[model samples]
Target: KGEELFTGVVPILVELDGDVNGHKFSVSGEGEGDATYGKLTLKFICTTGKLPVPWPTLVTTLVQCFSRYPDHMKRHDFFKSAMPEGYVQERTIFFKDDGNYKTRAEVKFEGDTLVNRIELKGIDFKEDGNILGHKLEYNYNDHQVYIMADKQKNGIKANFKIRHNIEDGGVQLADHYQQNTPIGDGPVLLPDNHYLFTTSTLSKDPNEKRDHMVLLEFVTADG
Candidate 1:
């Protein structure tokens, strides 16, 4: 096969771990989660993975509430059993981490208001690598970026990328309801003036120990 060149936004599919009660739930292709202060910021910052705007608003689908200490089977047991007898990562495209820093990923604006917030469209950030020393905090795009992975059961997958919309895959923002603040997680405007509430829900507690692993796939060419 030959190579193909394309330009588009990469995708990030978010998944979470279960509690002692055996309950776990996350959504995909939802909607632009609610906003705050005429701006949006992340509530559940990433724990282990690098963060391209590890915070919220502009980028909800990228960062997730993930923790490495927790005992999780969603990624370790299930994802591996379903995978073929090869490295699942080799099936897709990702940013080159050559020790030095380079543009890792970028977002394309389909509307006016920055759906995810922070960076404008087409502005790329460094792929998160070489973290010598840093503290994980819930601020703006402060961290490098989140770790990436996928699940290929049924129609759920974020393994690789190509030069075009591989499929009608839509990753939605699951942010809404009670920004846990006085300010409301209001609606985001769209082209046809549709206040599309790209939204989803999180656990009662967003501690990093209870962090949820995320699946980041995308539509790309320059990647």
Candidate 2:
């Protein structure tokens, strides 16, 4: 078995070169775009002892930047094949505050199935420093996901089954936003006064189209 073993610096380039609707843009490396939004590039250097598999982090960032743009990272073939077979990566990400709140996610593959689990701690939506937030698990098998969320204060044991893109017969949306007009956006859309959770998913196909989905859950105000 050949594992990617190397040393030194590995530079990764993520370029967004395209037009969306009538808006043109281009940018790279912590800079602004060219047109309103024509072309953009992101350069990441990972200097370590390993083949710099930069797609994990780079792809996630690209998806956010190109979220509503055409040629989004999910549609690119390069984003697919770059992943090594049965790869595993973990990191602690701070989404808000100054290292106040952190989310730990472990992304790996199980025989072509993408298994991602996340745990949130520290500061929460209310900025309570000691509050234990949420624990999420995603098992993408047969285009399905079993999700369970634990909110410590709520004392909620919730379980949900997700059948992804099933109604459309395996064809995913260009973008979840595009999935709706203004009134509705199907199961993936985030509604007002609601809690929305999102995670990325990768197709098992050789092309490995990468996309994300949202979990829409209902909770009573009193709880």
Best by TM-score: 2
- Misplaced by over 4 Å in model 2 are 1-79, 82-99, 124-223
lDDT of 2 by residue, 1-223 (tens): 1011101111223232212122223312221211113222333222222211112322222311111212322222111122323112222333222222232333233342232333323222222211112111222222111111222221112222223232223421111100111111222211212121333333223442332222111111100
Per-residue error at 100 for model 1, in Å?
A: 5.4
The segments of candidate 1 whose C-alpha lies over 4 angstroms from its true place after superposition are 1-37, 44-100, 109-130, 135-223
How many clashing residue pairs, candidate 2? 11
Model 1 worst lDDT window (10 residues): 1-10
**Decoy 1 TM-score against native:** 0.19
Question: How many pairs of residues collide in each model?
Answer: 32, 11
Cα lDDT, model 2, residue 39? 27
Q: After superposition, how far is residue 13 of candidate 2 from its true place, in Å?
A: 29
lDDT values, one for every candidate = 0.21, 0.23
